[PDB]
Amino acid sequence: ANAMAHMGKTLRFEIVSGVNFHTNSQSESLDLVGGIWQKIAKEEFEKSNIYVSAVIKPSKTVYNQEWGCPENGEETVVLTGVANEEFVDDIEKWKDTVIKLAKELKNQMKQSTLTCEFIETELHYFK
Amino acid sequence: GKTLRFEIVSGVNKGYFHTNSQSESLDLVGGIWQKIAKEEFEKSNIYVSAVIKPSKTVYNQEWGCPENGEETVVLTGVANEEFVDDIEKWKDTVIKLAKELKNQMKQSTLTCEFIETELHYFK
Amino acid sequence: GKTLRFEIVSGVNKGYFHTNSQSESLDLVGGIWQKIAKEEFEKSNIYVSAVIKPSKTVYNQEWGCPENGEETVVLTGVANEEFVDDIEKWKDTVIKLAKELKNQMKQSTLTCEFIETELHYFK
């Protein structure tokens, strides 16, 4: 079959959020966060034509119990995405958009704190 | 000294493999990776191990994403200087395996990223 | 504006701890990390938080990997400039904790990687 491959230097983001909502499992909290992210990314895309996709992974975050962490860690989700040159024209505008969406997710999940990191990456995209 | 890690995201193609949970799809992808990595190692003598995580990938429903995201697996590995002599050959091998996984999982698109990393290996 | 993140991959040593699910092995590793980070913080005033993910690691069955991969946990953390003053001291502390985890989990081998990152922290 025919095939295409693109390679370029770009950025990926990674966000960590709590899961706060009456979910009963990591499978259920994955679906919860997935639905919320899908809605906020869609709203942004309608304004700017920039769609910020994310891969979401179940996790627990371990920190000092004296700052409120439960024993053995707090239930969290990790969201990761990339600026794919096929869909993204301007890396600075994309980065600004990711930061905006991170703050909105923090609000929707009613979180006190939230992290968002940018990491340099070499993206190969196969079709 | 620096080296490289790779990360791939793949779908699990329920339409074709008919897994019923994230536990089952994790095992499916784990077994497929094990087989393709072994086949490649027999050809090139380069064995590419991967750490695999369950996930869901959220994109625009108008491009076919299910509500709340598509079931996916994330595969991540590294060029460990204890086992790898030539980084360029390793990178070429990872790209080969990414394409093979895309084929085996019958995926329309697939991503493979390389990230610079400083590996400490304790034995 | 740059800092460092770490990522560790560890086995869960079913031979010794006998966990029955990925949920149970996540809590096991979580509790061990919490205790070793606390003990270190009391000595050095450096607290190393981690986000822990369930996973499997796929390698050659001829080196002892189970079919479809071995149950593992991935631990990832960052040097947050709001809490961390000296990156070299932090990195040394992470290495110490990685070795201690290797000991507590009775692992033959363990990896710890450092990756450059740009951290935004929202309060």
Numbering used by the authors:
A (entry chain F): -5 to 14, 18 to 124
B (entry chain A), C (entry chain C): 2 to 124
Per the authors:
Although most signal via cyclic oligoadenylate, an alternative class of signalling molecule SAM-AMP, formed by conjugating ATP and S-adenosylmethionine, was described recently. SAM-AMP activates a trans-membrane effector of the CorA magnesium transporter family to provide anti-phage defence. NrN is replaced by a SAM-AMP lyase in some CorA-associated type III CRISPR systems, including that from Clostridium botulinum. SAM-AMP lyase exhibits a typical trimeric PII-like protein architecture characterized by a triangular core formed by the four-stranded antiparallel β-sheet of each subunit.
Purified WT SAM-AMP lyase was crystallized, X-ray data were collected to 1.70 Å resolution, and the structure was solved using molecular replacement. The asymmetric unit contains six copies of SAM-AMP lyase, with two trimeric complexes. Each monomer possesses a signature ferredoxin fold (β1-α1-β2-β3-α2-β4), featuring a β-sheet on one side and two α-helices on the other. The β2 and β4 strands from each of the three subunits interact in a ‘head-to-tail’ orientation, contributing to most of the trimeric interface. The T-loop connecting β2 and β3, which plays a key role in interactions with target proteins in canonical PII proteins, is shorter (10–12 residues in SAM-AMP lyase/SAM lyase compared to >20 residues in homologues) and presumably less flexible in SAM-AMP lyase/SAM lyase (given the loops are fully modelled in the lyases, but missing in the homologues, despite similar data resolution). Comparison of the apo SAM-AMP lyase and in complex with MTA-AMP reveals almost identical structures (root mean square deviation (RMSD) of 0.3 Å over 123 Cα atoms), consistent with the slight conformational change observed in the homologous SAM-lyase (Svi3-3) upon SAM binding. This suggests the proteins essentially have a pre-formed binding site for ligands. Given the proximity of the T-loop to the binding site of MTA-AMP, it is perhaps surprising that there is no significant movement of this upon binding. However, the side chain of W64, which could only be modelled in some monomers suggesting that it is highly flexible, appears to move through 90° from a position that would clash with SAM-AMP to a conformation promoting the π-stacking interaction with the adenine base of the AMP. This residue may serve as a gatekeeper to the binding site, locking the SAM-AMP substrate in position for catalysis.
